[PDB]
Amino acid sequence: DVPRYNHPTPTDKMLLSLAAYNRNHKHENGKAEYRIVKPKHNLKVDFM
RNA sequence: UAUGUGAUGGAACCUCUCCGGAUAAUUCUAUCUCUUCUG
């Protein structure tokens, strides 16, 4: 079967590289920014 | 805690009346699970 163009998209690459397994706090407000990878199109396409 | 020439209290059955009863086949097929990234 043919594998479609999936991984070289910048969003998938930055999501996979950004592990952030530790440094997670379950209390108080978080300090994160919408660091979209060179993409400003619409909402819901971002990350913390 | 008595008071004295006079105490059958051994002088009285907690007795009598009332179905632990009623209802129930030890039986058996449809999913489960939510975040995917422009496609």
Pair of tokens at residue A14:
């930055």
d(Cα A6, Cα A13) in Å, to the nearest integer? Answer: 10
A12 CB contacts (<8 Å, ≥6 apart)?
A6
Shortest CA–C1' contact from A3: which nucleotide?
B39
| Resolution value (Å, 1 decimal) | 3.2
A10 CB contacts (<8 Å, ≥6 apart)?
A37, A38, A39
How long is the CA A18 to C1' B36 vector, in angstroms? 19
Q: How many CB atoms lie within 10 A of CB A46?
A: 15
Q: How many CB atoms lie within 10 A of CB A33?
A: 8
A35 CB contacts (<8 Å, ≥6 apart)?
A46, A47
Pair of tokens at residue A27:
């209390």
**How open is the CA angle A44-A46-A47, to the nearest 5 degrees?**
120
Q: Report how this structure was experimentally obtained.
A: cryo-EM
